[PDB]
Design a protein around this ligand. Structure first.
Ligand SMILES: CCCCCCCCCCCCCCCCCC(=O)OC[C@H](COP(=O)([O-])OCC(O)COP(=O)([O-])OC[C@@H](COC(=O)CCCCCCCCCCCCCCCCC)OC(=O)CCCCCCCCCCCCCCCCC)OC(=O)CCCCCCCCCCCCCCCCC
Ligand SMILES: CCCCCCCCCCCCCCCCCC(=O)OC[C@H](COP(=O)([O-])OCC(O)COP(=O)([O-])OC[C@@H](COC(=O)CCCCCCCCCCCCCCCCC)OC(=O)CCCCCCCCCCCCCCCCC)OC(=O)CCCCCCCCCCCCCCCCC
Ligand SMILES: CCCCCCCCCCCCCCCCC[C@@H](O)O[C@H](CO[C@H](O)CCCCCCCCCCCCCCC)COP(=O)(O)OCC[N+](C)(C)C
Ligand SMILES: CCCCCCCC/C=C/CCCCCCCC(=O)OC[C@H](COP(=O)(O)OCCN)OC(=O)CCCCCCC/C=C/CCCCCCCC
Ligand SMILES: CCCCCCCCCCCC(=O)SCCNC(=O)CCNC(=O)[C@H](O)C(C)(C)COP(=O)(O)O
Lengths: 52, 459, 98, 178, 55, 110, 128, 124, 80, 55, 67, 88
């Protein structure tokens, strides 16, 4: 839900969801209080190498 | 102890003879008086138990359980009268009759001096609970929930009956005092192994042990609020009480028959705590919480140390109070919005601040914030397990972290954020609901002030 | 580019209505209609609490052994003891590395 | 946030959005104002160099190249306005926002204070109750048979009509409610 | 440290613009510790607690 | 450390409140003259954090460094301690240069 | 020209870096038009009840109901015992139990053997 | 340090080992050595409750400094002569330790070279 | 209270680094149409500011004077 | 609008920190430990309508 | 005290804040100079660090490479 | 206290100030209803720069979809007033 457009007029602003639209199976994992899959400046598989 | 039994039997015709508009008032007042009377049972001795007669006795393990039962009756009465307003007078009286009969059976179960009488009462507690669930539940899943609740219990309890009558034919008595004084060790044979299993599995399924708990989410979600209160607060503790009673005759066989149940308890504790992290129904989360806490209680009973028994007693009392409070908190929102989905109604702290404070205190006691009796029990059990084996701390440690995570997840999902825009029927909290929450929470801290009253006979 | 006449007109009407609502949110002068010594802090917040604490420690806490334990006071050469009156000798004729 | 979106963006819209993003990230890199002005003028010259390309294929190829360069050279910690969706004060005052329908449940003693405010509230409620059916019927008339195709709403056209679906836009809580 | 930081802050006044190095990206993004440790363990834990424990 | 760390955060809060709840240093200009007392306090706190002689920071950090140097210890730990105590002065310098020196970069409604 | 960015599961591909949105077809434009039409129709259906003066309550959402029902009640009816299902169930439900059993049994056997030989340093171990 | 570079890069054979030191008898090279004496009694040190680490050979100066500090309590700037005396004693102790380290290095270098050159004499 | 914006025509890039920026963009054929919007950051009381070393030695003169007079008093106070 | 609550919260944190600091047994120290932890949790999410604060 | 916005001008400063800032900067610098004048050993070290090489073998007791 | 209660007159004054500090717009020829494309002869990039200049002046960003639409100073002032709940 972090990747959704924050400038859109969502029915539920906090959840960034619209009434009646299909809900992802793993929505509770993605509620943006939680796991974030948003694109990063540096690639994955490059951050891991540097950190390790 | 007929001075407590007889007043409840009098609650029965008092309810059935009351005016149509005074049943709740009369039942609540006299239930509270009976609780005050039962408060006298806390004056216990240091060496033996209070032996009232040939039939009833009171120990330092059963007195807090009796007090909890008698205190839980009025709270259930207050919690039930909201959603039963449109019901007819006769059916309301029948509901109160079911609750009174359940209390009477529970009171007699915790003080029976013989194991067969204890069995008969501990099995008689089934009928009122099943009737309540299947008659006054809301959804069509209540019938299946009642079937699951009945058969899971009976399939464990019938071998216990066979084992009990066999033991009485062998040793000549089932009286608990005689059983304790004339105890003899159990050899290592297949007959003794199956006797152990028959004496243990019914209480295991009552806790319930992980893998045998599938009935509990169904029954505790599909029941009405009073049913959920009494199922979580008192009826799960029958297994723990019975297990601590029966383990007297199971030594030294337990020394190795406890391994599968210990592994199941620890790993399934981790699993049920993890399950609580992805739950869309708010009541199922509280049910799985109960499963995790009861797994801890099972571990404590199985390792058989004084510290583990003290921790088990304290944890059972604390969990009863906390889980009943959490169920009532969820039922308030359900009555407001007629849905159990957790992410439907959000930002409720903005609309209901005092109810948010009650939510915060309940979820703080759920995660065992010190010096609550929840943490006293949990820490005693953890220390006993560490003495049993130093590697349990890892599993125990993981559980503590997970419990905090899902408790605060529930709190943040329900109370914080922004209120859903379309829901405009969230009325202010009634005085009844606030009084219910206060009567749940104040005894917890009061008991924290004097913790030797819930630490059991091993104190 | 820009708005269309429909959007411009709808924004105009909504803006007028919203400003009317915001104006209506204002309070008239009478709106909050309410229906019908110097050093006393140092007495009720310092003196009174320390009276209860000192009484509780002097006559209740110290009525049992090992409840208030104080580490023994340091003793130095050339000191004299209050109770016994014993004096402690000096310190072994310093080599005087002046 | 106020306008209804379209089914897609156009090429010039994408170019303008990339231009704004690049200017903002360059300002993030160039902290000082004179250096920012220098490099912003350079960026504008670079943008308007290829302004006159009549081959749309090569225009989109250049846009793709520019987006790739921007992603490689973006600021990892760009400046965000405090109330923008990533700022330090983005949703700070959302907990103070209370919907207007909550006032319907105030105790009469609470409503005894503020009589004129509640009189105005009653007037507004009567206005909404009178205008609802006209709004619904206007929406019914102006809607194509195959349902609406955008999220744009029609305005009021008649004598004393109101723009349909206005109550929850007009009666927003506030931006600084408490 | 004072002198080196002063030099590296004075050079920001120059009209020169160069893309950042990987050392700067490591320092600014906190070594990518929150970028990886707040996404991989949480994802695997929650996904396993749904797919395996519950279902 | 309690003293100067708390006062450094307090000066940061003062700057944040004055500039309409802005926290980014890239939009903080020349506050050396516009904020004389805040500038004085932040300079004193930065000098104490860096263990300037005879200040509060010095009576602990100086002894800590000189006791790390005269002990049988891991050599890598000593090297990292020295590099970190250089980076401390470097970060403190960054706040002062960016927040207090130069020309304004905040919105024009002062 | 510049180093390339490769997407991952927990760090996805940006929209401006997606080749599929830079080579478009009128079929794609038609699909976007249909998507916007469906979204707008759902939005209008919601807003009609949202602004209704006589509506008191919770506006029911069939999407939320479908989500919860799929996550809870629709799972077992759509379950088939397959080699994958059987292997994953056996592994994740059986392996941890015997792993922890082996660990705890080994630890306690070692402790008991040490106790038998009289060398465990149980001095001051009053409480268990 | 230079001793660390000498030990970890140069010949570690003739470099003293800080953990295993000394390796030579205390009276090896010296004809006679005075026994290092102590000024403060064990009972005095116990009564003053110094520390297990401050009970070194300079403990008497520390006792004097502590007594002067307790006597001159409000004037916390009067205990300078005693503090200087204690610091001087500790400096002399550190000088002695440096000397011990110095002694160990030369003996190790001298003994090993002398025995290897005697082996060289025996090799011809 | 009740204060109006200054005249917009007093903002000139004349004599500020914006001058230099304009010269270097003129050397390339470009132009900077926004310098006057940034001229206020250099125009008035923000014209000049101290250096890092100048900031660090903020109150050194007064403190040094007090230190010197106190040391002199110490030196001709031990003559008692 | 809730400054009184904020002041009460700050005071609560101070009390728990004193309990932590003066504790003589491990149970009292743990009480102070968890008290300051809970107080910091409540004070970090002071603006409870903001998702990042709760996170 | 009332200070009004300026809109692109240097903000209004009251005499007291500059007086306080200068006073505290001056007192810090005076404290540093005074405490260095009276406690220079705390920064420069107090006792001379000796050199091992200049210690004679007589006081260090090493044999003349013969025994 | 905090910042004063921003009014429509102040918003318009600041918008016109920023627009008259623009070198590509003549001061006197500019009016509160002047169109950016028709009357003033600016392209899209100049409009983007003007939107960014407005953002800097008021301290808050404007979404691109909303920003594209404004064409005259009246639209900018109206959008700012509607955003910040300015009614007087
Ligand atoms: C420790 C301080 C000691 C103080 C001495 C006197 C204390 C008397 C308290 C009596 C018991 C409290 C009653 C519980 C119900 C709450 C009442 C209520 O509904 O609020 C309405 C009431 C009306 O105000 P309102 O404007 O309507 O606000 C309503 C809104 O919802 C907004 O409400 P809000 O935002 O203001 O929040 C309400 C408040 C209240 O909500 C609560 O959570 C309070 C309940 C405590 C947590 C319960 C679970 C944790 C387990 C700990 C068990 C400790 C109990 C000990 C025995 C107590 C016996 C009663 O929550 C909080 O503010 C923060 C809660 C986090 C507490 C963290 C502390 C952890 C433990 C620290 C040490 C504890 C042991 C002390 C000794 C240690 C060794 C020396 O609110 C208040 O007046 C404020 C409540 C007072 C705060 C008490 C917090 C500290 C007390 C802890 C236990 C008492 C220890 C006494 C021993 C002496 C030491
Ligand atoms: C005399 C006896 C004592 C001798 C001590 C040592 C003697 C040498 C003296 C010189 C010491 C260092 C002097 C400066 C160092 C570099 C300065 C610098 O900034 O360079 C710019 C450059 C980046 O500049 P930029 O990104 O264009 O600038 C940003 C913009 O200007 C945008 O600007 P902005 O506003 O964002 O500002 C950026 C910011 C931040 O700038 C950066 O982003 C880069 C930060 C670099 C400084 C880091 C210093 C601490 C390094 C600790 C390393 C720990 C181990 C790491 C292990 C990594 C393992 C993967 O710049 C600063 O704030 C100043 C930076 C720090 C200045 C003061 C440095 C003091 C500490 C070092 C001197 C210590 C003196 C006392 C020593 C006492 C020893 C007993 O960074 C570097 O290239 C040099 C950093 C050193 C990294 C070397 C690591 C090796 C890389 C290759 C790996 C090979 C892998 C092999 C195969 C592996 C297979 C597994
Ligand atoms: C899903 C959750 C359900 C609840 C979990 C209930 C847990 C029940 C587990 C029972 C625990 C132990 C039962 C028997 C004790 C020992 C088990 C046996 O494997 O140990 C060896 C036994 O050796 C061999 O294993 C023989 C048994 C092999 C046949 C048993 C069938 C096990 C297959 C698994 C079926 C699943 C059972 C549960 C159904 C759900 C010991 O060697 P031995 O010394 O000789 O026997 C000791 C008895 N003596 C002294 C009289 C001789
Ligand atoms: C000891 C047993 C366990 C030890 C820990 C192992 C890993 C624990 C895995 C925890 C799984 C929890 C799943 C659900 C958590 C709640 C969801 C969640 O927190 O999402 C991530 C959430 C949001 O992300 P942000 O970056 O803050 O973005 C905010 C701006 N948008 O942030 C978090 O809370 C992530 C926290 C996860 C940390 C797990 C990694 C820690 C591992 C520590 C190992 C090192 C041990 C230390 C050794 C010390 C030396 C003796
Ligand atoms: C800090 C690091 C980030 C910086 C990296 C970014 C680098 C990008 C620089 C190079 C990219 C370009 O210029 S790519 C230029 C692409 N060329 C075309 O699209 C030709 C057709 N013209 C049009 O479509 C419109 O006229 C339009 C031009 C949009 C104006 O719109 P108005 O006139 O109607 O307002």
């Amino acid at each position: 839900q972090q990747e959704r457009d924050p400038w859109y007029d969502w029915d539920h602003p906090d959840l960034r969801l619209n009434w009646g639209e299909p809900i992802h199976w793993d929505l509770d994992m993605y509620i943006r209080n939680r796991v974030d899959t948003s694109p990063t400046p540096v690639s994955w598989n490059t951050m891991c190498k540097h950190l390790f | 102890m007929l001075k407590i039994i007889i007043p409840t039997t009098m609650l029965l015709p008092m309810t059935w003879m009351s005016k149509h508009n005074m049943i709740w008032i009369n039942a609540t007042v006299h239930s509270l008086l009976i609780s005050l009377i039962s408060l006298s049972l806390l004056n216990q001795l240091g060496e033996n138990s209070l032996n009232f007669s040939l039939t009833f006795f009171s120990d330092s393990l059963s007195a807090p359980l009796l007090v909890l039962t008698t205190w839980l009756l009025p709270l259930m009465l207050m919690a039930s009268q909201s959603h039963l307003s449109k019901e007819t007078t006769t059916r309301k009286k029948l509901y109160i009759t079911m609750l009174i009969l359940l209390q009477l059976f529970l009171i007699m179960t915790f003080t029976a001096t013989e194991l067969i009488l204890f069995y008969i009462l501990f099995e008689a507690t089934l009928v009122p609970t099943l009737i309540i669930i299947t008659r006054w539940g809301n959804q069509t899943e209540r019938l299946n929930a009642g079937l699951y609740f009945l058969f899971y219990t009976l399939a464990g309890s019938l071998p216990l009956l066979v084992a009990l009558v066999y033991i009485q034919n062998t040793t000549g008595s089932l009286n608990f005092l005689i059983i304790h004084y004339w105890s003899h060790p159990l050899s290592n044979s297949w007959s003794n192994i199956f006797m152990w299993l028959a004496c243990i599995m019914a209480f295991m399924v009552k806790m319930p042990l992980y893998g045998l708990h599938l009935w509990l989410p169904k029954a505790h979600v599909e029941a009405p609020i009073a049913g959920s209160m009494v199922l979580a607060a008192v009826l799960l503790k029958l297994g723990g009480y019975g297990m601590m009673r029966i383990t007297t005759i199971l030594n030294p066989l337990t020394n190795y028959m406890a391994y599968p149940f210990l592994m199941l308890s620890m790993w399934g504790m981790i699993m049920t705590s993890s399950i609580c992290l992805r739950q869309t129904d708010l009541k199922s989360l509280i049910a799985y919480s109960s499963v995790s806490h009861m797994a801890l209680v099972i571990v404590a009973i199985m390792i058989q140390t004084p510290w583990s028994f003290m921790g088990a007693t304290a944890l059972m009392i604390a969990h009863g109070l906390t889980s009943s409070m959490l169920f009532c908190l969820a039922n308030t929102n359900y009555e407001r919005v007629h849905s159990r989905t957790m992410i439907l109604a959000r930002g409720l702290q903005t609309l209901l601040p005092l109810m948010a404070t009650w939510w915060l205190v309940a979820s703080l006691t759920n995660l065992a914030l010190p010096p609550s009796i929840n943490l006293i029990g949990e820490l005693f059990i953890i220390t006993a397990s560490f003495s049993w084996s130093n590697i349990t701390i890892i599993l125990m440690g993981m559980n503590m972290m997970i419990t905090a995570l899902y408790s605060l997840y529930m709190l943040i999902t329900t109370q914080r954020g922004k209120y859903t825009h379309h829901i405009n029927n969230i009325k202010p909290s009634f005085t009844r609901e606030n009084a219910l929450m206060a009567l749940h929470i104040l005894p917890l801290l009061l008991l924290t002030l004097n913790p030797k009253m819930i630490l059991g006979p091993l104190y | 580019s820009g708005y269309t006449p429909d959007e411009k007109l709808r924004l105009q009407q909504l803006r007028e209505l919203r400003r009317r609502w915001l104006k209506d949110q204002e309070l008239s002068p009478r709106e909050p209609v309410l229906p019908p010594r110097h050093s006393i802090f140092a007495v009720t917040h310092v003196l009174i609490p320390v009276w209860i604490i000192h009484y509780y420690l002097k006559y209740h806490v110290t009525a049992k052994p090992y409840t208030v334990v104080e580490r023994k006071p340091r003793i130095f050469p050339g000191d004299t003891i209050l109770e016994t009156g014993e004096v402690i000798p000096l310190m072994k004729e310093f080599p005087d590395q002046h | 946030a106020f306008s209804a979106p379209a089914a897609y963006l156009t090429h010039q819209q994408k170019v303008l959005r990339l231009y704004k993003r690049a200017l903002r990230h360059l300002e993030s890199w160039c902290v000082h104002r004179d250096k920012y002005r220098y490099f912003a003028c350079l960026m504008r010259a670079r943008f308007d160099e290829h302004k006159n390309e009549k081959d749309m294929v090569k225009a989109t190829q250049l846009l793709r190249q520019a987006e790739e360069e921007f992603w490689y050279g973006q600021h990892p910690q760009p400046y965000i306005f405090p109330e923008s969706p990533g700022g330090t004060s983005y949703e700070r005052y959302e907990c103070y926002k209370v919907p207007e329908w909550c006032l319907d449940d105030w105790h009469p003693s609470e409503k005894a204070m503020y009589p004129d405010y509640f009189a105005k509230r009653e007037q507004w409620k009567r206005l909404r109750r009178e205008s609802w059916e006209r709004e619904v019927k206007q929406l019914q008339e102006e809607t194509p048979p195959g349902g609406p195709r955008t999220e744009a709403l029609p305005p009021a056209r008649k004598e004393g009509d109101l723009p349909p679906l206005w109550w929850h836009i007009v009666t927003r809580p506030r931006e600084r409610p408490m | 440290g004072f002198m080196l930081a002063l030099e590296l802050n004075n050079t920001t006044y120059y009209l020169k613009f160069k893309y950042p190095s990987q050392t700067y990206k490591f320092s600014n993004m906190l070594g990518y510790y929150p970028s990886i440790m707040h996404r991989l363990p949480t994802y695997h834990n929650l996904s396993m607690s749904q797919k395996s424990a519950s279902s | 450390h309690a003293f100067f760390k708390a006062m450094l955060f307090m000066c940061s809060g003062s700057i944040i409140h004055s500039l309409n709840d802005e926290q980014d240093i890239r939009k903080m200009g020349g506050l050396y003259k516009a904020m004389p007392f805040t500038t004085t306090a932040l300079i004193i706190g930065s000098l104490a954090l860096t263990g300037m002689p005879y200040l509060t920071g010095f009576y602990s950090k100086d002894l800590i460094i000189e006791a790390v140097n005269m002990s049988y210890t891991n050599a890598w730990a000593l090297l990292m301690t020295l590099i970190a105590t250089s980076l401390t002065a470097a970060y403190s310098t960054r706040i002062i240069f960016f927040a207090f020196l130069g020309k304004p970069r905040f919105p024009p409604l002062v | 020209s510049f180093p390339k960015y490769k997407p991952s599961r927990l760090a996805t591909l940006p929209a401006t870096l997606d080749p599929a949105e830079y080579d478009i077809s009128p079929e794609t434009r038609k699909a976007q038009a249909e998507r916007l039409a469906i979204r707008s129709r759902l939005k209008r259906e919601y807003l009609l009840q949202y602004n209704d003066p006589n509506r008191l309550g919770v506006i029911e959402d069939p999407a939320l109901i479908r989500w919860t029902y799929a996550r809870s009640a629709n799972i077992y009816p759509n379950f088939r015992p397959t080699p994958k299902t059987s292997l994953l169930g056996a592994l994740f439900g059986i392996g941890p139990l015997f792993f922890w059993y082996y660990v705890f049994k080994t630890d306690r056997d070692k402790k008991e053997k040490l106790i038998q030989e009289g060398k465990l340093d149980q001095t001051f171990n009053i409480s268990y | 340090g230079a001793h660390l570079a000498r030990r970890y890069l140069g010949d570690a054979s003739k470099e003293p080992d800080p953990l295993r030191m000394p390796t030579f008898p205390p009276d090896y090279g010296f004809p006679e050595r005075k026994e290092r004496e102590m000024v403060a009694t064990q009972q005095e040190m116990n009564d003053a409750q110094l520390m297990l680490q401050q009970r070194d050979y300079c403990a008497h100066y520390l006792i004097q400094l502590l007594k002067c500090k307790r006597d001159s309590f409000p004037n916390f700037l009067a205990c300078k002569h005693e503090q200087h005396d204690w610091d001087y004693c500790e400096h002399l102790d550190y000088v002695k330790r440096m000397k011990e380290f110095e002694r160990e290095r030369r003996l190790l270098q001298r003994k090993k070279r002398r025995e290897q050159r005697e082996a060289e004499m025996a090799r011809g | 209270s009740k204060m109006e914006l200054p005249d917009y025509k007093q903002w000139k890039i004349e004599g500020t680094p914006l001058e230099t920026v304009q010269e270097k963009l003129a050397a390339r054929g470009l132009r900077d149409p926004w310098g006057r919007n940034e001229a206020w950051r250099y125009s008035g009381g923000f014209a000049n500011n101290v250096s890092f070393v100048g900031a660090l030695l903020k109150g050194f003169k007064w403190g040094f004077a007090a230190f010197v007079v106190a040391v002199g008093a110490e030196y001709y106070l031990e003559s008692q | 609008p809730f400054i009184n609550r904020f002041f009460k919260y700050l005071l609560l944190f101070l009390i728990t920190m004193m309990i932590l600091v003066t504790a003589n047994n491990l149970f009292q120290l743990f009480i102070g430990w968890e008290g300051v932890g809970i107080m910091s949790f409540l004070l970090i999410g002071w603006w409870h309508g903001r998702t990042d604060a709760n996170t | 005290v009332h200070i009004e916005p300026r809109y692109r001008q240097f903000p209004q400063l009251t005499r007291s804040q500059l007086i306080q800032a200068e006073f505290f900067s001056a007192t810090m610098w005076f404290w540093i100079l005074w405490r260095f004048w009276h406690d220079s050993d705390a920064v420069l070290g107090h006792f001379p660090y000796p050199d091992p090489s200049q210690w004679t073998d007589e006081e260090l007791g090493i044999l003349p490479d013969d025994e | 206290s905090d910042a004063p209660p921003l009014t429509l007159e102040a918003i318009k004054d600041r918008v016109l100030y920023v627009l008259k500090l623009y070198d590509k717009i003549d001061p006197e020829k500019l009016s509160v209803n002047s169109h950016f494309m028709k009357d003033l002869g600016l392209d899209s990039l100049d409009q983007v720069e003007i939107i960014m200049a407005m953002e800097d002046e008021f301290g808050f960003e404007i979404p691109d979809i909303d920003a594209e639409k404004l064409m005259c100073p009246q639209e900018i002032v109206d959008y700012i007033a509607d955003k910040k709940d300015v009614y007087e």
